[PDB]
Design a protein around this ligand. Structure first.
Ligand SMILES: OCC(CO)NC[C@H](O)COc1cccc2ccccc12
Ligand SMILES: *[C@@H]1O[C@H](CO)[C@@H](O)[C@H](O)[C@H]1NC(C)=O
Ligand SMILES: [Co+2]
Ligand SMILES: [Co+2]
Length: 434
């Protein structure tokens, strides 16, 4: 697709700190851009929609190529349409925003310039941020994560995409998402099926796969840390049910691991570590700091800080694994005790290390889950299981929780605030900010 300018595109600014082994940090100035799926897609020479509700224009978009030629993405009113605001080093994302229409959530990328994504090489480094999850109830996910996207949003590989990173093109993740309206400079109208339960979405004939590092998927009740390897590291189109992932009949057929090697302290047995109020180690009514370290072995270490008190990732025991480092032994024991072979089929942390060794794009989002009600994060899942089933209970939310229409109606003022991002060599991010 191309870009149109009926609505101006001004990326909300956002600063962050780049830290050095020598003990100082310096401020960087970036900005955030909203993903192309949230934008108005219209004809290049008029205001006629190419996509509206959950259907495409049969005349403007008779096939994927013609559609991309005829159609453009327009600019975003970040605050009044999408409930997205920044201030200095802080980003806030509202849940439901009512303007001329209702909007739910946002998926945003950190930019290096107004036309390019910021890339981060995670391996050997650590990533620190502060988060307020206090306004996130059951069924919501305030996510901070990385994916192996192209810095230009795909423009160099697919010149029929001229909109680029400036308009949030090129997304991919470990679900091989098929709800994307444009992939590889072509629309996704061919094979489009509107969502049975969402007036605004559907599933197309193509998806977009890449490696995904879920640093933070969380609400006020539950939080998880999850790497997801893919057999192709970077962004790659997939075909229909061959995609696998949540959007396909079979989730395990494809090139990505959609489950991941997840570390959720509640799921692993420490039900007192994280939750609302003073009965938990980390009180989710208050801001907290989350630090994630990518040691060169390919293992992942984690610690938290709240009110000046530091806590490592809590220790877990699972099969023959004992510790608090997310390593090969952990992931293997997880598969043995909780089930599944997706993570190891896709090459585990060794394959994942290929993603963290290269550049990844930072994503911040707030979403509700039209497929599984976020039960996989904060409830018992599958819902027919009980606590006797190992790993079934991931959080304290009811198995009835997280119905999108219900949480949208009941908690429209929900929001997440990410702030004070700091990145650099392991051991460096706790030093003074410049
Ligand atoms: O927060 C950012 C998102 C970006 O996709 N990360 C999702 C992870 O790839 C894991 O995804 C899922 C794992 C299990 C069940 C799921 C059910 C519905 C949707 C997603 C599911
Ligand atoms: C949970 O983890 C915290 C922090 O490591 C620890 O102090 C606490 O004793 C743990 N509780 C349980 C029940 O494991
Ligand atoms: Co095709
Ligand atoms: Co180690």
């Amino acid at each position: 697709q191309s870009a149109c300018t009926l609505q101006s595109e001004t990326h909300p600014p956002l600063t962050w700190q780049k830290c050095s082994s020598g003990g100082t940090c310096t401020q960087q100035t970036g900005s955030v851009v909203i993903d192309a799926n949230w934008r108005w897609t219209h004809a290049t020479n008029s205001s006629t929609n190419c996509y509206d509700g959950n259907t495409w224009s049969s005349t403007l978009c008779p096939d994927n190529e013609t559609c991309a030629k005829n159609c453009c993405l327009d600019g975003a009113a970040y605050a009044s349409t999408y409930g997205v605001t920044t201030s200095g080093n802080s980003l806030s994302i509202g849940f439901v925003t009512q303007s001329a229409q209702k909007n739910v959530g946002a998926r945003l990328y950190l930019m290096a310039s107004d036309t390019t994504y910021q890339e981060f090489t995670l391996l050997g480094n650590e990533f620190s941020f502060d988060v307020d999850v206090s306004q996130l109830p059951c069924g919501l996910n305030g996510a901070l994560y990385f994916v192996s996207m192209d810095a230009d949003g795909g423009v160099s590989k697919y010149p029929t995409n001229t909109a680029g990173a400036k308009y949030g093109t090129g997304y991919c993740d470990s679900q091989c998402p098929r709800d994307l309206k444009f992939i590889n400079g072509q629309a996704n109208v061919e094979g489009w099926e509107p969502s049975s339960n969402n007036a605004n979405t559907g599933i197309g004939g193509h998806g977009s796969c890449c490696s995904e590092m879920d640093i933070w998927e969380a609400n006020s009740i539950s939080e998880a840390l999850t790497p997801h390897p893919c057999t192709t590291v970077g962004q790659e189109i997939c075909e229909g049910d061959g995609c696998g992932g949540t959007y396909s009949d079979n989730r395990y057929g494809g090139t990505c691991d959609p489950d991941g090697c997840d570390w959720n302290p509640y799921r692993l047995g420490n039900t007192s570590f994280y939750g609302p109020g003073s009965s938990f180690t980390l009180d989710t009514t208050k801001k907290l700091t989350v630090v994630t370290q990518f040691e060169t072995s390919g293992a992942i270490n984690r610690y938290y800080v709240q009110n000046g008190v530091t806590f490592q990732q809590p220790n877990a025991e699972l099969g023959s694994y004992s510790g608090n480092e997310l390593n090969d032994d952990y992931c293997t024991a997880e598969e043995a005790e909780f089930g599944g072979s997706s993570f190891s089929d896709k090459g585990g942390l060794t394959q994942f290390k290929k993603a963290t060794s290269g550049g990844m794009v930072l994503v911040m989002s707030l979403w509700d889950d039209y497929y599984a009600n976020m039960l996989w994060l904060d409830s018992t899942y599958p819902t027919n299981e009980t606590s006797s089933t190992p790993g079934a209970v991931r959080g304290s939310c009811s198995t009835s929780s997280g119905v999108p229409a219900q949480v949208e109606s009941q908690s429209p003022n929900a929001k997440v605030t990410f702030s004070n991002i700091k990145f650099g060599p392991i051991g460096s991010t706790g030093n003074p900010s410049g």
